[PDB]
Amino acid sequence: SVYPKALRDEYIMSKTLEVKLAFERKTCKKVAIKIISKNVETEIEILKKLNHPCIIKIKNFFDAEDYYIVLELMEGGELFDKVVGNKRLKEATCKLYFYQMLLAVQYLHENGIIHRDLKPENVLLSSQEEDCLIKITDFGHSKILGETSLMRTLCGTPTYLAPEVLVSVGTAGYNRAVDCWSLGVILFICLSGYPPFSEHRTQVSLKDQITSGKYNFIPEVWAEVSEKALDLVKKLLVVDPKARFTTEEALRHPWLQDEDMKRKFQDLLSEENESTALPQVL
Amino acid sequence: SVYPKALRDEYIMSKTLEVKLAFERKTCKKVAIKIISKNVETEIEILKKLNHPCIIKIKNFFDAEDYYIVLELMEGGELFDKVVGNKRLKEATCKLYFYQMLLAVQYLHENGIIHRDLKPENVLLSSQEEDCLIKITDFGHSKILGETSLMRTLCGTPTYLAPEVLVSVGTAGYNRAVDCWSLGVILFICLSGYPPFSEHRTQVSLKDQITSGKYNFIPEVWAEVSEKALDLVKKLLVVDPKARFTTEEALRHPWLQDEDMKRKFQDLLSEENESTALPQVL
Ligand SMILES: Cc1n[nH]c(N)c1-c1cccs1
Numbered sequence A, B: 001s002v003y004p005k006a007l008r009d010e011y012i013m014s015k016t017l018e019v020k021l022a023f024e025r026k027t028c029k030k031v032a033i034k035i036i037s038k039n040v041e042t043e044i045e046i047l048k049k050l051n052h053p054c055i056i057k058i059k060n061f062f063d064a065e066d067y068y069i070v071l072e073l074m075e076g077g078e079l080f081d082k083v084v085g086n087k088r089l090k091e092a093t094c095k096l097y098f099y100q101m102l103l104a105v106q107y108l109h110e111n112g113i114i115h116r117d118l119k120p121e122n123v124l125l126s127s128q129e130e131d132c133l134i135k136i137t138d139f140g141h142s143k144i145l146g147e148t149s150l151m152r153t154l155c156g157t158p159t160y161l162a163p164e165v166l167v168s169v170g171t172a173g174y175n176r177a178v179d180c181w182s183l184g185v186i187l188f189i190c191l192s193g194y195p196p197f198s199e200h201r202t203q204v205s206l207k208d209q210i211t212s213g214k215y216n217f218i219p220e221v222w223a224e225v226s227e228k229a230l231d232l233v234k235k236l237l238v239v240d241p242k243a244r245f246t247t248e249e250a251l252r253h254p255w256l257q258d259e260d261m262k263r264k265f266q267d268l269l270s271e272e273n274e275s276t277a278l279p280q281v282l
């Protein structure tokens, strides 16, 4: 194969990062082209509507023999590459990155979007520096919250309504809580260098470990981590979704009540913004 | 307002049955026009694809200032009108009508469609005769079963997967069972002349009655009804959807093992078909 004439007209394609590096011809600036073999409809619609510094932006789109999505290039790569092979980040770097992951997911939920696939491989770092801006990516499994079939059903008389439907009312509207569980698994991995649930050196099934919410706690590893960080992990890795910490609750947790970390994020933010800055009305 | 020029071109509109009576100009045959104020997308797609004698057929469609759906005219009206005001059908008529309702819902499920709104007001009778063909209508709340987000999710490793998601695996794929509950409430109403769950002369909430599956049993009323009929009602009005009778299970129940009723249905079927009948290759 070859790239479509339309893409080629605007971009000079390069090395694989399938995601490839490309140069926008107009600006000579680098971009990332995500190629999907011929759901991408919702993904583009979600991404076009979202506007947050910790959420990846669509720059352009091509629907040809394959789907081509032009995105912001993140030079630091994946968070996965910083946590793989029992490698662990400094507690302060976990805080900085986590704080941004919380802001991004709070924005998503505020905007009626559930990501559904949060992992270290879907978290991108802006630079090769420890202190940097992170961005959430991969909205292919994301879900849009609107008016439910349940809300419509509850309007009528339930003379003919099945009991399982009435039982589901208790839990309805807690889907977003799956993202908070994911964040707790990401935070555990970042702080410890190891996954909370695994089939490595265990008799109990990965399924049974998760439903019981009995994560693997290794004291020697966690002794290096503060009580505050672990308290937040414990609060997100709660089995009952109605009881689990929300992004707002996590954001108010003592561990995130750090003015230093918050200043470093604002600093990185304005450093990135300095290029875009239009003159101000005094 | 007025009717669109496109509808008027083909049909001479009449009296209200909003659903109106109309005459197709080409054939002079009567039709029913369902008017919806400007979901009807799925409804038309579902109805165009379905082909069963106990399911209503779309004859035509108009998307104007309002949605106009041209349907088969059912001269006997709604089943509701035969059961309202404590009126009760003969046990044999219940069997005939129920047998057709089961065939229709079996077809729907076989074809990956869940109706979601089965009631006496959505069951239409073909003629003003007790022994007639019934048809299922109102596919506006209907749902299409395809490949789930759950099936896709189960393919990956659940390292980051929330426990409620793994718990939902146990019940997944039992949505169709809501239609069987509805059928049990319809069968109860038809045989008794009264609803199984109501706020009339009760202290217990309609919600609590349904989730407990504790229907109102009045012995004086049900003494007139056979043990076999009541056994089938009891089997459909089961709270656990995994244990509840399916349409196939209902169809194999002793109450429906009636060759007389089955011959009367085949008789009504061929009487309706006699008009359409193209010569046969001997
Ligand atoms: C999008 C995007 N922007 N910058 C990078 N490295 C990506 C990648 C996503 C997935 C693999 S690489």
Ligand SMILES: Cc1n[nH]c(N)c1-c1cccs1
Residues within 6 Å of the ligand: B017, B019, B032, B034, B056, B071, B072, B073, B074, B075, B077, B078, B124, B137
């Ligand atoms: C459709 C249809 N065909 N024949 C009748 N009576 C209808 C009605 C549906 C709802 C009210 S009337």
Ligand SMILES: [Cl-]
Residues within 6 Å of the ligand: A001, A002, A003
């Ligand atoms: Cl090429």
Ligand SMILES: [Cl-]
Residues within 6 Å of the ligand: B001, B002, B003
């Ligand atoms: Cl008119």
